[PDB]
Write an enzyme that holds these catalytic residues in place. Structure first.
Site, PDB file in Angstrom:
ATOM      1  N   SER A 110       0.861  -1.096   0.036  1.00  0.00           N
ATOM      2  CA  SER A 110      -0.005   0.018   0.006  1.00  0.00           C
ATOM      3  C   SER A 110       0.783   1.238  -0.055  1.00  0.00           C
ATOM      4  CB  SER A 110      -0.768   0.012   1.251  1.00  0.00           C
ATOM      5  OG  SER A 110      -1.998  -0.819   0.927  1.00  0.00           O
TER       6      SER A 110
ATOM      7  N   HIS B 130     -12.060   0.731  -1.931  1.00  0.00           N
ATOM      8  CA  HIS B 130     -11.250   0.286  -0.968  1.00  0.00           C
ATOM      9  C   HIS B 130      -9.931   0.746  -0.834  1.00  0.00           C
ATOM     10  CE1 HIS B 130      -8.894  -2.861   1.219  1.00  0.00           C
ATOM     11  NE2 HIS B 130      -9.863  -3.086   1.700  1.00  0.00           N
ATOM     12  N   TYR B 131      -8.987   0.790  -0.026  1.00  0.00           N
ATOM     13  CA  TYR B 131      -7.850   1.584   0.375  1.00  0.00           C
ATOM     14  C   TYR B 131      -6.967   1.171  -0.865  1.00  0.00           C
ATOM     15  CZ  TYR B 131      -6.075  -1.692   3.609  1.00  0.00           C
ATOM     16  OH  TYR B 131      -5.521  -2.846   4.282  1.00  0.00           O
ATOM     17  N   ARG B 132      -6.852  -0.040  -1.012  1.00  0.00           N
ATOM     18  CA  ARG B 132      -5.731  -0.953  -1.763  1.00  0.00           C
ATOM     19  C   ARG B 132      -5.839  -0.679  -3.355  1.00  0.00           C
ATOM     20  NH1 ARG B 132      -6.380  -6.306   0.866  1.00  0.00           N
ATOM     21  NH2 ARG B 132      -4.844  -5.771   2.816  1.00  0.00           N
ATOM     22  N   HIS B 133      -4.659  -0.482  -3.970  1.00  0.00           N
ATOM     23  CA  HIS B 133      -4.439  -0.238  -5.293  1.00  0.00           C
ATOM     24  C   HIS B 133      -4.229  -1.476  -6.214  1.00  0.00           C
ATOM     25  CE1 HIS B 133      -3.073   4.322  -4.813  1.00  0.00           C
ATOM     26  NE2 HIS B 133      -3.885   3.855  -3.647  1.00  0.00           N
TER      27      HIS B 133
END
Lengths: 184, 184
Positions: A110, B130-133
């Site tokens: 992240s 969502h925070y993930r890439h």
């Protein structure tokens, strides 16, 4: 210049931060590790507690204060004399002996989150990076959709040691190269 | 609710921007695509030219003005009546029928760059993620170090059609699943 300085070496970084919006949050710990392109650790870099006011620490979400305390980070933040620039210069200095400026993408879990803060509080560092991200969690997301079984067999741990944190991010990658890649 | 609304669907997004520092730059085009977890396209979303002043367009680095013009984007920016919010609401509206809020990570190439601007100019959208890439370029970087031969056999193209851009980012992923993954 160490012998293994190489334009394909990879820079791993893991910030600790006081909240998620950089525009009201600040760095409070910085760590780095350099590996070769094949994830062999070359060097561990400066692990540094960046000092921040008691009020910004007090504005910290209850969750982060719990963790940072039990880890003991705050004890260091508060005993820290390091400025952001001091931290940064010290890390740059380090990185410079191992990878050229602009060559490695930013590596870890992240790490887009970390880079937001570098860009605001440590832009020379942020610039030392190629623009591309090497986000291990990218792979986790893919595995979770295309091969979840391998996820029931890797679930890492914390530790109040940043260098251990990076090492698990690496461990994790190493794990996907193993059971999720096909390298030939 | 379409039949294929599913918490594992993936949201692909590709902004066009006027420069790289969001704090003096702005969005000028927005596009989205939803796929299922296996990269099957479900829907193409709003492709929208976000209008911006002539002076901010004039402050644009010479490289971006060249491209945006030959593509014809500016002709649209300048004929645009859309605000950032108008763009955003319209995309949200769309996304909402296909994936739940907070479920998909942000997907595309180097999408950390896009998200910086969402977070500042379209935070509801930024929050829909969502925070993930899920950064396809993550994989390119890995292939370039652990299996470069597969890179001499995939080199995509532009086109003034955002939806084609996303489609190549997807095409690319699809390519790594093929020659760089081991899915069993």
């Amino acid at each position: 210049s160490h012998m293994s300085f190489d334009k394909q070496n990879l820079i791993w970084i893991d910030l600790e931060m006081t909240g998620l919006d950089p525009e009201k949050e600040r760095i409070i710990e910085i760590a780095t590790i350099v590996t070769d392109k094949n994830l062999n650790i070359l060097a561990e870099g400066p692990v540094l507690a960046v000092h921040q006011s008691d009020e910004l620490l007090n504005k910290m979400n209850d969750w982060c204060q719990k963790t940072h305390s039990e880890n003991g980070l705050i004890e260091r933040i508060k005993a820290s004399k390091l400025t952001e620039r001091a931290a940064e210069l010290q890390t740059l200095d380090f990185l410079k002996k191992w990878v050229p400026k602009g060559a490695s993408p930013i590596c870890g879990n992240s790490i887009a989150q970390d880079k937001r803060f570098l860009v605001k509080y440590m832009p020379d560092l942020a610039d030392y990076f190629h623009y591309r991200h090497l986000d291990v969690s990218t792979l986790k997301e893919l595995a979770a959709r295309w091969k979840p079984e391998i996820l029931e067999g890797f679930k890492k741990e914390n530790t109040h040691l940043a260098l251990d944190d990076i090492r698990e991010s690496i461990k994790e990658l190493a794990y996907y190269r193993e059971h999720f890649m096909k390298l030939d």
